[PDB]
Design a protein around this ligand. Structure first.
Ligand code: CHL
Ligand code: CLA
Ligand code: CLA
Ligand code: CLA
Ligand code: CLA
Ligand code: CLA
Ligand code: CLA
Ligand code: CLA
Ligand SMILES: CC(/C=C/C=C(C)/C=C/[C@@]12O[C@]1(C)C[C@@H](O)CC2(C)C)=C\C=C\C=C(C)\C=C\C=C(C)\C=C\[C@@]12O[C@]1(C)C[C@@H](O)CC2(C)C
Ligand SMILES: CC(/C=C/C=C(C)/C=C/[C@@]12O[C@]1(C)C[C@@H](O)CC2(C)C)=C\C=C\C=C(C)\C=C\C=C(C)\C=C\[C@@]12O[C@]1(C)C[C@@H](O)CC2(C)C
Lengths: 149, 68, 201, 41, 196
């Protein structure tokens, strides 16, 4: 959509050069072997590697020199939004399933409210491993009809 | 009330100990002592984790940190 | 009730009645008030004592023979840097697997006693031990010393536990002596014996 | 003691331990894979 | 009855009547009795298919290595050309497998529902437990005793593990399945997962 790749972005190169020039301005103030100078020299390399990696991944830059993210579902940009999205969904489902399974276990007690303050660690440690298979567990429970009260 | 006052005194002493220690290890006190007017006092230093080390300014005396 | 205590004239805790071997009523922090904690801590102490006897004899005996002039084995501190026929991580993995099987069997024995007393593949062979932590049987007790009158067993277990405490202390001492002085444990003993008054700090 | 375990299982202390471990872990990845915007896998 | 971990009580929902039972369910996935049947059928089918796949992608490699025939490895079989396009063969497979898979699915729902031939009405399969059709599928008329079922399930589990191992072998090392075994035997203590 009028976007150019990072590796061929003159404004991207200008941003990198300007940041490096600004960083090197403070390097001249200290002795070359001093600890502040050693710490500063490690910052320039980090900037260089970051810019190289951004160029190497085929990110798209506009007229500003800043990368843009395409989330329409293009197969060449699945790492921007699609790939991290499924990971977040899996992790959030794990957390939710563990939290839901803990409450059901203690609901049958005489005083279920007491277990919400003093957490039963031996009981909680067993349920934690069970969240690994939460997609299959939820898929099977939905079909059987036990998901909704 | 007596015991609570004792606890508060303990906390204050711990705070003073921290303040006195930080100026001995992470400060430019000596360089400032050699030139009080042109050097900015500093006693805090930041770890370089998420790029936050930009807060280590050039306070003078061959030292980088936060000006107190 | 009238057994010697660690602090004479003091009151021993109510959860240490002297039935256990090597009991001297020492628990100021009360780390074993509950019975399950008592049993777990007893097993931990026994295992630590046995590993200590195994390790302590393997540190001072080689160095004694080296300094006396019989062998030439290097210092125990730097024994992890010597050459070997394979990478140390492979040795670590093999050790992990074998000790994992052994310690898993032992763990199964603690929680549900009597559940691992039969050979998995040769049901004829069994272990004749009755108390947790003392397996007995032909594999571990070949000489028959593990069974007898209760007084003899109590005395033997007491002396084993005391030797274990001594060995644990000695091993920690060897570690700290070598981290501090920078020489072998036997050299420290000889330096101390040469001039006991001055050869310390 | 038993009271030591019971006080350690209360909601604030357990939550603080969990969040501290979480923050340490997150800082570990942020240090190991710094300046990350896309998945290169 | 076998136990997968001594000192651990088996779950109550595993009564031991099923074939190949060892009380193994740490996650409690088969708590609901309905889920148990579907999981059993899925395990059986996966075991049989994995067994066939592992055999068919291990044996030709050995045959090529010894020198009887000359066939490429299992992963690169797609580059070879055949008498028909891959899309055509996929179309034959898609139409063909639909019938048998729907037949099996119909049997799973209602046992004994699809035992009768739909074209010729005089041929049918004898009654039997679901997942074991018998009849024409057992031409030699072997005894389907519990021991044979246990052997089948054990072989299926081993085949699943072997297939996963083969996939991971190819993904990391990039070599053949049988080539790795010969490499391991040359220097056992120097050629291992640790080095790679
Ligand atoms: C299960 C299964 C596995 C593990 C593989 C293995 C692979 N096949 Mg595949 N296939 C599988 C099903 C099938 N394949 C094929 C026919 C093909 C072809 C023609 C090709 C593959 C290719 C591939 C690769 C795609 C990435 C991958 C190594 C591609 C490849 O080998 O590139 C490296 C390729 O060109 N497969 C058919 C018949 C329709 C299948 C059913
Ligand atoms: C790890 C080794 C270990 C273990 C598990 C035990 C365990 C036990 N001992 Mg014991 N003991 C040991 C080493 C050990 N001992 C040593 C080295 C000595 C000689 C000094 C003794 C001398 C001794 C006596 C005289 C008596 C016991 C008794 C007991 C039992 C009751 C006390 C208890 O439960 O406290 C729990 C014990 C623990 C070790 C839990 C660990 C708690 C602390 C925090 C460990 C760290 C301490 C360390 C010095 C601090 C490091 C911090 C810093 C310096 C770096 C219990 C089974 C009593 C008994 O009835 O015996 C049957 C008793 O009368 N012990
Ligand atoms: C209330 C008083 C107080 C306050 C606000 C601070 C605050 C701080 N101290 Mg600190 N400190 C104090 C008392 C205090 N200290 C005392 C009494 C001592 C002992 C004399 C120390 C010894 C000390 C050391 C040795 C170090 C700090 C460091 C730090 C900084 C990082 C803290 C950290 O990473 O914690 C992490 C979280 C924990 C729970 C620990 C932070 C600004 C660190 C620093 O500035 O490094 C650049 C550092 O290395 N402190
Ligand atoms: C760290 C690995 C390691 C290595 C390289 C050695 C190496 C050695 N041990 Mg040894 N040992 C070890 C761990 C190790 N040990 C452990 C963990 C224990 C417990 C022992 C207990 C032990 C005993 C009891 C003896 C040795 C002896 C020896 C030496 C004779 C070799 C034969 O047998 C040899 C130098 C023997 C010897 O004479 O030492 C010189 C001997 O009597 N070891
Ligand atoms: C001072 C050292 C010392 C002493 C006095 C004992 C004494 C004892 N051990 Mg023993 N043990 C020791 C060190 C020691 N052990 C070490 C270092 C290990 C680890 C290698 C073991 C591992 C061990 C096992 C595995 C078993 C014993 C058992 C026994 C008891 C009967 C077996 C026996 O001694 O006959 C010689 C045989 C006896 C009380 C047995 C027991 O109590 O069960 C009946 C038993 O099963 N010990
Ligand atoms: C079995 C226990 C034991 C024994 C026999 C020794 C013996 C010795 N140690 Mg030592 N040490 C030990 C444990 C032990 N240590 C432990 C646990 C530590 C860590 C805290 C140290 C740390 C240590 C250092 C840092 C140094 C020594 C040194 C020495 C030697 C000179 C004496 C001295 O100044 O020690 C002083 C010992 C201590 C300050 C530790 C207190 C003693 C422990 C707690 C045991 C308690 C006594 C024990 C119950 C007596 C009964 C056993 C008896 C038969 C010996 C001497 C050979 C010195 C050396 O190399 O000689 C030139 C030296 O510089 N040790
Ligand atoms: C299950 C299964 C599946 C899906 C396949 C699939 C395949 N086999 Mg095969 N095979 C199997 C089991 C299986 N085999 C078994 C159990 C044996 C024994 C063999 C022995 C075998 C040989 C000897 C050859 C194949 C070949 C082939 C490929 C082309 C032949 C074809 O499909 O027509 C194809 C990918 C051929 C191949 O890879 O060359 C194209 C070939 O030469 N297979
Ligand atoms: C019973 C099945 C089985 C068998 C016989 C083997 C056999 C072998 N594997 Mg292997 N593997 C398996 C399953 C199996 N694998 C599975 C399921 C995985 C996925 C986690 C792997 C992943 C794997 C890797 C990543 C590598 C091997 C390698 C090897 C070879 C060297 C031995 C080794 O490093 O062990 C490795 C064993 C493990 C990592 C443990 C797997 C779990 C065990 C086998 C379960 C069965 C008991 C050897 C021929 C190495 C090779 O290429 O040799 C040169 C190698 O780099 N394997
Ligand atoms: C546990 C221990 C110390 C004990 C701590 C004590 C007293 C705690 C006591 C208390 O709790 C009580 C009782 C009651 C509470 O109210 C109070 C406190 C005070 C809290 C020491 C050693 C603990 C652990 C020991 C002994 C470790 C042994 C190591 C081995 C076997 C090493 C082997 C090798 O050396 C070889 C043989 C050859 C080499 O080449 C390679 C290696 C591998 C190095
Ligand atoms: C079927 C199967 C393999 C099928 C393969 C085929 C057809 C191969 C075909 C090919 O070779 C040919 C034909 C040609 C090759 O050219 C072409 C291809 C296509 C390559 C694998 C299954 C593989 C399946 C595997 C490995 C599953 C493992 C599951 C496990 C372990 C579960 C563990 C648990 O479930 C229990 C155990 C208890 C639960 O409670 C909880 C836990 C503990 C979590």
């Amino acid at each position: 959509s009028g976007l150019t790749p990072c590796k061929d972005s003159k404004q991207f190169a200008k941003r990198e050069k300007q940041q490096i020039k600004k960083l090197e301005s403070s390097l001249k103030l200290y002795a070359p072997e001093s600890a502040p100078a050693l710490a500063l020299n490690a910052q320039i390399e980090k900037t260089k590697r970051r810019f190289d990696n951004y160029g190497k991944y085929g990110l798209l830059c506009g007229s500003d020199g800043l990368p843009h993210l395409i989330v329409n579902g293009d197969q060449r940009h699945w790492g921007e939004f699609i790939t991290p999205g499924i990971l977040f969904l899996y992790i959030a489902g794990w957390i939710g399933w563990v939290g839901r399974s803990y409450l059901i276990a203690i609901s049958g007690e005489k005083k279920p409210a007491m277990k919400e303050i003093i957490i039963d660690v031996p009981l909680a440690s067993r349920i934690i491993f069970r969240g690994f298979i939460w997609p299959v567990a939820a898929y099977r429970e939905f079909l059987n009809g036990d998901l909704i009260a | 009330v007596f015991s609570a006052h004792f606890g508060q005194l303990s906390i204050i002493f711990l705070w003073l100990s921290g303040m006195y220690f930080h100026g001995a290890r992470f400060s430019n006190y000596e360089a400032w002592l050699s030139d009080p007017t042109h050097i900015g006092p500093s006693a805090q230093v930041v770890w370089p984790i998420v790029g936050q080390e930009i807060l280590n300014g050039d306070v003078g005396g061959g030292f980088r940190g936060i000006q107190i | 009730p009238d057994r010697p205590i660690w602090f004479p004239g003091s009151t021993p805790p109510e959860w240490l009645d002297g039935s256990l071997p090597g009991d001297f009523g020492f628990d100021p922090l009360g780390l074993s008030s509950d019975p399950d904690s008592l049993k777990w801590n007893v097993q931990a102490e026994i295992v630590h004592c046995r590993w200590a006897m195994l390790g302590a004899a393997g540190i001072f005996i080689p160095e004694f023979l080296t300094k006396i002039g019989i062998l030439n084995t290097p210092s125990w501190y730097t024994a992890g840097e010597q050459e070997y026929f394979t990478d140390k991580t492979t040795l670590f993995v093999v050790e992990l697997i074998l000790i994992g099987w052994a310690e898993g069997r032992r763990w199964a024995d603690i929680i549900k006693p009597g559940s691992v007393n039969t050979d998995p593949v040769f049901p004829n062979n069994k272990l004749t031990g009755t108390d947790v932590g003392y397996p007995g049987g032909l594999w571990f007790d070949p000489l028959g010393w593990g069974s007898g009158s209760p007084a003899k067993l109590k005395e033997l277990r007491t002396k084993e536990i005391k030797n274990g405490r001594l060995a644990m202390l000695a091993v920690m001492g060897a570690w700290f002596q070598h981290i501090y002085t920078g020489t072998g444990p036997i050299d420290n003993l000889f330096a101390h014996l040469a001039d006991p008054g001055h050869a310390t700090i | 003691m038993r009271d030591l375990k019971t006080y350690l299982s209360v909601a604030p202390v357990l939550s603080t331990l969990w969040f501290g471990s979480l923050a340490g872990l997150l800082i570990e990845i942020n240090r190991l894979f710094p300046d990350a915007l896309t998945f290169p896998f | 009855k076998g136990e997968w971990l001594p000192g651990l009580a088996s779950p109550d929902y595993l009564t031991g009547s099923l074939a190949g039972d060892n009380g193994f369910d740490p996650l409690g996935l088969a708590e609901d009795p309905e889920n148990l049947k579907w999981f059993v059928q899925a395990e059986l089918v996966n075991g049989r298919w994995a067994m066939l796949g592992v055999a068919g992608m291990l044996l030709p490699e050995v045959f090529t290595k010894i020198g009887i025939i000359n066939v490429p490895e299992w992963y690169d079989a797609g580059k070879e050309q055949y008498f028909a396009s891959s899309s055509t063969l996929f179309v034959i497979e898609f139409i063909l497998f639909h019938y048998v898979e729907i037949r099996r699915w119909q049997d799973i729902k209602n046992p004994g529902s699809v035992n009768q031939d739909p074209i010729f009405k005089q041929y049918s399969l004898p009654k039997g437990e679901v997942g074991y059709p018998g009849g024409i599928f057992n031409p030699l008329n072997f005894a389907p005793t519990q021991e044979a079922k246990e052997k089948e399930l054990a072989n299926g589990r081993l085949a699943m593990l072997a297939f996963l191992g083969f996939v991971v072998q190819h993904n990391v090392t990039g070599k053949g399945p049988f080539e790795n075994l010969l490499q391991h035997l040359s220097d056992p203590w120097h050629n291992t997962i640790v080095q790679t």
